[PDB]
Structures are given as structure tokens and as C-alpha cells.
Amino acid sequence: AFELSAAEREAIEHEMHHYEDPRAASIEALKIVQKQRGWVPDGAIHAIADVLGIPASDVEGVATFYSQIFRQPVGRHVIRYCDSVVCHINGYQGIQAALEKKLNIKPGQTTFDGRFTLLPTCCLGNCDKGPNMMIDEDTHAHLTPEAIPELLERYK
Amino acid sequence: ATIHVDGKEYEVNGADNLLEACLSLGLDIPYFCWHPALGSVGACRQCAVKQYQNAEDTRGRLVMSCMTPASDGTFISIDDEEAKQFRESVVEWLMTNHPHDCPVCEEGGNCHLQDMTVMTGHSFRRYRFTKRTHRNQDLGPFISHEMNRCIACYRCVRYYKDYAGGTDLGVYGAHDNVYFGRPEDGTLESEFSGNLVEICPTGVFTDKTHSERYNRKWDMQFAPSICQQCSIGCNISPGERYGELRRIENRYNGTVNHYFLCDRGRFGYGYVNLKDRPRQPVQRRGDDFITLNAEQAMQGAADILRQSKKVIGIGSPRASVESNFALRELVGEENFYTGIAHGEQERLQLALKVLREGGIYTPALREIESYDAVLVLGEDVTQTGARVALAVRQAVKGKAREMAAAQKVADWQIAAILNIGQRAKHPLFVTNVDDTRLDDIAAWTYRAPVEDQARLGFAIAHALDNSAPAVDGIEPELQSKIDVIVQALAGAKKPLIISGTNAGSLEVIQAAANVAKALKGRGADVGITMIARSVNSMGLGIMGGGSLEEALTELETGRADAVVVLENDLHRHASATRVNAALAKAPLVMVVDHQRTAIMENAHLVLSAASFAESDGTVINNEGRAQRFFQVYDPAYYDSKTVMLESWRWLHSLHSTLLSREVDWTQLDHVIDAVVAKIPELAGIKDAAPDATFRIRGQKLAREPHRYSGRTAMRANISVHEPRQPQDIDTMFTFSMEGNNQPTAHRSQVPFAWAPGWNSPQAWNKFQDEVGGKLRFGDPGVRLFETSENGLDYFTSVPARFQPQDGKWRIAPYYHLFGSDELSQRAPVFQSRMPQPYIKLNPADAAKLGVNAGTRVSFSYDGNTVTLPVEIAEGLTAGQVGLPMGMSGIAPVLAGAHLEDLKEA
Amino acid sequence: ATEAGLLGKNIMGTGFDFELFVHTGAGRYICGEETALINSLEGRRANPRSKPPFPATSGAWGKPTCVNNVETLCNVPAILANGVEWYQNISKSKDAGTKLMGFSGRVKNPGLWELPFGTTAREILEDYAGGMRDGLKFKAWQPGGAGT
């Protein structure tokens, strides 16, 4: 039983004002629902489809095509560490090992208290300051395996 | 254009891409993602050829033949070593994740992926890693889903969304986890979802009704038949094994139903395999139902008919032309009655008169897709003539086709065409009592009663041509919509007007004829399409006869002491109480039928007739084209006690035994000659198919493939001695593999498509002159009439607007593709798909009666009170109650009738 | 820029109306391909499109569409402000103008500098990135990212 809030619907319609086709606001509508709720539940696909006037299959295909639209529940904070080539040269693997040691989870999983979800991501465009991670909206650079426990404690 | 493939020069069409041009020349290029009806996208990367810049060139470049135009002076190579290596590599990449599933997969022996794996020459596996795995979904009762076998060729999404207009099937996921299916478990909502089993080159989408009793393609006995579930007349290949109808495949007809059927025709065949069907003639003596063979039944029926003073015959639009004519010959021309009611017959004859006397060219089903504006009046096309609705969708996308052609974009580059024509589409204006399934693409929809839709049509015809009768009492908003429709239709180069007899109103057909005449008077290239109800409704209209009410009057008055009912249940065209009383008053009722109907409880004699799978005959579809359907199998081959003959054979033998006291069964060509000799209107049915003496270099046409198996064991449980091969004296086909089914054979009737190396439905490419075009030697079927030199006059009978009277309820017809056709509800797979029997109520009327959604209300029609649950219909106009036509207890004759004492029970 | 008259309607009184929007993506690398960029802008799955037709003829929503990088549109104002003759005389090479170059990965100064075309890769590594780090010996290099 999913319903769209008034703020979500107003933001979606304001995004629909920017384009000559209402279909072009599907990614931003999914991102609005994700920002308000953490992830995009199953009923949100049909709600966004009904608001936008496009089929629910198109909304589901868009939501499952893009990696940063979550169709599965996540924790209250999303750690996204870079596993691309320059951070592999700069040694992201120690960062990933420290994250797995502290959080006691594998990448793609959520902690038992729902606090952190660990995810690998593509290159963040911060390769000169690698290795890089991005917690919910802040990108942290110059990472060391000893700074991970201190850095993770500031995200309650 | 001039192309050079492997050093050999060919002349092709320059507007075609290289793949379809080379496949039309007989050259073999493997392909997955391309379809002739869907265009080229360049997805599967299988069709790679090597193109050279000029005549002298050794390097070349691997190009995509489906994405490359066959321009003049092209130089390509198929058998180049690099091209062959890359095509084998593409097959190998597809086979890295493919499950080891061919023995337990329903596409085995019919699989395009199997054919192209073998044809590229890939048989050695060096991949040693894991294969990706997908969970499956429940797609309903008709389509079985197995996503492991997918090759991500995108044919399903392209067909179902871009072509068929469906909204519930899509592609999800990412890099190599792409999932093709519905967003959640549920039935596929489209009326053309059954074509996925032929569109999918793998076994992801499979025929589940076929999968229940599965047999491979080489084990089938095929025949070229006509679908018997509505009036469109789509060409089908019924395939049989072990004495039961196993599958309906799409048989290619480049004029009617080229690659696609609808779900009613593809999954509604299950009434043939019903176990309560009559297999022997049965005579009712007191309370006993004794069983006769054919000769004693003929002798007894002839004796009783000879003692009678007047025998009348009630035909049906279910039966073929030959069966109706044989009944007419048995009972006499003046004693022959068509099985439909007076109003249904009047609407049918008016639609026939408009078609063959209105001077406006009625198009074929393929020709519908080239019209520039479509006006559907009164008819719910998606639920009655669904393939016409699909062709209307293609005609609507014609505007995007024209917009892309104006920018010099090739017609096979479907993605560029859809990108250029974003949402611009040809005008579609649909009128109905409620919303239709064409409303997502319609330029406008009119939800109004049939009188108001007729008035809208008359007003459109008057605004187009001032000599047409005018309509007074039009609201300014409705007048604005009327002039929008008129401005859209007048600016169209090829307008098309679609109506039919399913609206239950003569005035809707008259208004559509007026619109077509007004568009013809302005010099437009107007076409008109009329949708009939049953498979041979046009044939029964052309042959003609009295109505069912006159036959019931003759039975009630005692002037007729013998009634012969041919392939009719008599309850869809008249009230059940009146039919039961008239049949009980008749001292002889004789029912010639292949389905156990309710009028056999009072029938003195029952003849076990044959269905379309066990009979030969001719049917006339909605466009007036005569089409022959052939017998699939001998019902007496397995059960030797089964005496089930053709209806025309039964009635001709009865006529012979009544006249000369001797039994002569017939040959089919004798009945065809009798029809074309006595009825000059049906004289064109002779050219529908060649006679039984037609041969291809001296040999007959094979019904079953050459690798048909089990010949010495499939009947061994009955007797170890192999029986005689069944003889087909009626037609040119043989009930064996000892025949001709060559793609180059000079014939038009193709029972099934198979070429060496092409075991899938892609062998139809080998069976066509050009791929996606017509058959090589023309399509089967001949139009019975040409367009008239002169048209009709304007119909001045403009009805008044609908007035909701107190205490009465106008019955608005609601049609369903699963449930309205008579024979399709008998198929047990349809009961999971047919909707629950409802009654549609307007919110104001439901609030006036104090009934919510779902509560039961009881109404009395013809002194018979039945109860139905209420569904709230927003688009239904007040004063109307909506009834599902053709369901159990609700005859289709109830459309437009008034309903009394509709009250909550 | 909108509140100061550089954007919106009637920019600098010339009557040219231009509206600028920012469309944040949803994390997929293929979206940088310009036809897949158009498909993602239209709210579809970011599958690319077959060319021809190019986006300049029928691109976003079937209209003429030009897709250009950030750095190209950042090079444009200097060309329009200082002229063509200045921009053609920055470097004596076939590729005109300046490019943002830079070395990354276990070097002394991993960063990003603006250099004229024709600058050799050893100068970017040694004179700008400071060479390789202590205890590390140079083995290989990729000139233009992960796809080179």
C-alpha cells in the first residue's frame, strides 16, 4: 500500500515542467522518491507511472537500469567506495578490507542495525586524490585503512 | 539496385536493407534481433557480412547487413572467413550462458537459436565458467516463461510495446542481467500476447496450452485452415498428434494476417479436444440414446423426413458455405432459415450491401495499415476483430513513418523512425458505449449510446457533405469535436471507416456508410471495413434465408413438423424458453453438430458432425474473401468406432437417401460445383483452393513433415497391425509425409513452413517471394466481389438522441475477446482467462438504486430473473446497463434490448 | 546569470531566449555516450542509438540536438572573447588551443594542469607531476583514461 506524498507529487510535476515530454522526468521522479524514502519500493513504480502517464514497465526498466536508484532496501547511510583503476593503483583494497572488517559485512549488504550499506561504485572523478569513497552526500579522499574507523563514527 | 554477393551479381530493391534483400535471394545469413514486421535495430550483432568499397578490394569491413542499405553497386561477402568467424563467435557468446535445456524445452526442434547455432557451425564448447541464471515469472494461462533461455535479442519488447502497443512487458536490469518480462507476476494483458511464442527465437515464451500436451514439430500433422473464432479469417496451421488438436500456429498470408494472430484464435481451439463431443450418430428412443453407424442413421432420418409434411432447416454462421448450402438443398430454398435473429440478419445484410454495393473499396487486413486516418463507429474492434485493431495501430504509426521518410531515413531503421515521430500519430477516432483498448492511441474517444454514436456519424457525414442528412440537437462542445474529426478526416489522403454488426444498431452502420460516401464524394481514397460476428457470417448473409424467428414461428404454428439444426445452439439468437418450447412441439428435431449443445436433450436425432480440424470447407471473412480450410486429421484413424463426418457430407447423404433411397456421401468438389452453379453470388469460392486432382509434379501435398515418427507404434496399443493410411478424396493433401512441401512448389496453400536449416517460423522467409511480402505464388483466398461502379444513396433515417426512460434499462453490449465467441468459452483454458460475469452500472444510476460495487442485482429478461454482481462503469452513460455479450446466460442478441425490474436481490 | 539578465528571455536586449537546466544522472557509465545521453535525457534506458541519423539532425525528442563536452564549451568563450587569430597561435601544432592534461597514480604531484597541445608526456610526468614516487619505478602509462 504505497501512496505518494504531496511534496513528492509537487516536486515530480515541477520536474515535468522542465521537459517537452513527461517521460523525461522518470529518473528525477525516482530520485525524488529515493531521497524522501531511502529507496524506491514496489508501489512507487506504479505511483510514478500513474503520475507521469508512462507504463509501469518503463519506470521499472529505468529504475533497474540505473545503479544509483535503489529498488532494494538500504541502510540509513550508503558507503560507496571506488574500485576503478586509479584507486586500484592507489590501493582501494585496504580500504575495502577495513570497511568489511569494521562493518562485518560484504559489499552489497546492509549491517544488522541498518546503519550502513557497503557498495562498490565506478570512478568518482577524484583520481588524483585517490582512493576515494562517497558516504551519503560527502566524498572522502586520501583514504587510509587507519582513518576508516574514525571516519565511519561521524555518520550516526 | 545492383549488389554483388560473393562475386555474384544480383538485382534487389534499393529501399531494403541487405539482410532482407539477401534472404529474399535465397542466401543464408544468420540473424536474431531483426524481424520483417519489426524493422532493424542492430542488437544481436549476428548478421555480420563483409562489405568492400568497390570491385577491387581485399580488406573490407564487417558491416551489419540488417543495418546496411542495399544500395546500387554494393559489394558484400557472406562466406568470407572473418565474417564466418565473427558470426560463429556471436553464436558462441550467446551460448556461454544458455542452459542445457533442449530436451525439456518446448522450443526444441522449432528453435531459431538451434538453427543458427547449427548453421554457423558452432558445436565445440571451450567456455568453462558458470552460466547466469534467472528466476521465472507467471505470465498467465497462455504464455509460459523461462528467462534462462534468453539471448537478449529484444524482439519481445519491440513487438509487444512498439508493435502491439502493450504496456506490461519490458526490459529491466543491466549489462548481462537484462530481464525480459512483466514488472510483477500476472497475466499478460495484451490481446496479441500469443505472438510472443513465434516472435521469441528461443524458448523463453512458449505456448502453455500446447505445453500441457506437448509434441515436437516433426511429430505434428498440419493443415492450412482458417481461424473460426471471429470474422477476420486469419490463416492458421492447426497441428495434431494422437487424435487431438495440439497447437494453432500462425500460417503466413501476406494479404490478411501475415505474422500475427490474436489470443482468441491462438488459444481458443480447446473445444475441439472436449470429451463430451458426439463421436457417433445417436438416436433418441424414449429415454434411451441408442448409437447408430452412418448408414442406419441416414436411412432412419430419411424415412422420418419422408413421412414429414414440411422439413425446415436452420443454418448457422458457424458452419461453412458447403454445409449451409447442403442444408438448403436438403430442405429447399424457401424452407431454409439462417440461424441468426431478425435484427442481426438485418444488420448483417445492410453491412453486406454497403460492402458489395456501396462503391467504396473494402481493404484487406494488411492494407488497413496504410490508411492516414481511422474512424471506428460503434464497433469494439479489439474485443471482436482484434487483428483489425492491430492493423489500426500500425496505420496510426504511419504518421511517424511518413515524418521519418521525409528526412530520407530508411523505412527499416525503426529506431530512427520512432525517434523522429515521437508522439505524432495519425488521427484515430473511436466511438463506443465505454472505453476501448484502442484509447491509448486514439485521437478522440466518444463514450455514448449507439443512437448517439450514429448521430455523431451522421453529423460528421453532413459536415463533410452538405447533401447528407443533418442532425439537429448537437451540443456546442460535441460540435467542436465533430469539426475536429471532420478537419482530420478531410485532410487525410486515405481515410478508413470501420464499423460492424456488433454494435447492435442499424443506424451506426448507416452512419458509417454515410461518412464513407461523403468522403468518396470529396475525391478521397476512402476505405470501409465491416466487422461481422462469426467465421462465416458473410457467407450466410450472401446465401441468405429467413430469420430464426420465422423458423420458430413455423415450428410453433405446426406448419413444420421436422427441423434440421446445423451447427447452431439456438440460444445466442433467440430466447431459451421460446426455442425449447418450439423444439419440444416439433415431432422431429435433428441436430447436426460437433459440440454438445443444450438443444440435444430434446433432439430426436443427433449427427456427430466434424469441427474445422476434422472437416474441409469454405468460409467468407469480413472483407468478402472466400477461403478454403482443409481437414487436419482423420478422427476414425485412432478410434475406429468414431463416425464423425463433414456436415455437408451428412446433409448431402441425407438428401440422396431422401430422394433415391440410396446413400452417396459426396466429394467436396461436387459440393463446390453445386454452390457455384446454383448461387452465382458464391461463384467465386471455386478459386479459393484448387481441386483434389491438383498435384505438384504428380505428387500430392504433405500434411506432416518428412521426419514424422512413430508410424509403426503410435496405434500399436490398439492393434499391432498398422492400418491403412487415411485417404483424402476431398482435397489435394495427403494424410502422410508422402507429399510435396517444397518452398518453390507452385502452390498457395502451405500447411506448415520448413526448410532445411530453418526449423523455426523463420522458414516462411524461404516460403515468400520477398521476405515480409506475399507468398511466392500469391496468397490463398479470392475476394467474392469487386467494388461497385456506383454507390448507394444517403441514409436519411437519423435516430433521435438516447432518452433514459424510467423503469427500463438499455443493454449496452460489452464484448470480450475471451468469452464472447461461442466456441472459445468451451475451451477449458479460457475459464481462467474469461472475466467474472458482471453487470456494468453508471455511478449515478447505481447511487439512485442504492447499490455499491460488487453487490448482486437481479433482472428479468423474457420472464427469466438472473443475478449478477455490479461493476461501476464511469464512462457508461446513465440510463444504460452494460452486459457482457456472449457469456453464459447472456445471448449476444440482447444488445440494444431493454431491461426491466433491475433491482438488488 | 538569470537574475542578472544573462539567461532567460531577451538576453542583452537581442531577443534571444535561452533556458538552461541541470539534469543530475543516476549513476551509469554508458550515459556519457551522446545518443545514450539523449536516451537518458528522455527518461529511457540509456541504450545508444545507431548513427546515421546523427543527433544534429534528429536528436533529443526528434529535434536538432548538439552534444558537447564541458571543456569544449569552456574553450568557446575564450575564442569568442580574444578571437580566432589568438587561439590559432597558442601552439604550433595541428590541434589548436590548450588541453587539460595531467598524470595520476603513485606520482609525486598527482593533479591536473592546462597545457598547450604538443606537450610531450615526459614533461607532464616529470616537470609537472614530479615523476614517480620514491621506491617506485615507472612501468607503463595510459594516455587518455581507462579506454586507451
Ligand SMILES: Cc1cc2nc3c(=O)[nH]c(=O)nc-3n(C[C@H](O)[C@H](O)[C@H](O)COP(=O)(O)O)c2cc1C
Ligand atoms: C562509452 C562512451 C562513454 C562516453 N562518455 C562520455 C562522457 O562521460 N563525457 C563526455 O563528455 N563524453 C563521453 N563520450 C564521448 C561522447 O560520445 C561525445 O563524443 C562527447 O560527449 C561530446 O563530443 P565532443 O568531444 O565534441 O564534445 C563517451 C563515449 C562513449 C563511446
Ligand code: SF4
Ligand atoms: S531455447 Fe532453443 S537452444 Fe535454448 S534450450 Fe530451448 S531449444 Fe535449446
Ligand code: SF4
Ligand atoms: S525473451 Fe526471447 S524475444 Fe525477448 S530478448 Fe530474449 S530471446 Fe529475444
Ligand code: SF4
Ligand atoms: S482476429 Fe479473429 S480470425 Fe483472427 S485469430 Fe483472432 S479470432 Fe481468429
Ligand code: FES
Ligand atoms: S579511479 Fe577512483 S576516483 Fe577515479
Ligand code: FES
Ligand atoms: S539481425 Fe542484424 S544485428 Fe541482429
Ligand SMILES: [Ca+2]
Ligand atoms: Ca475430408
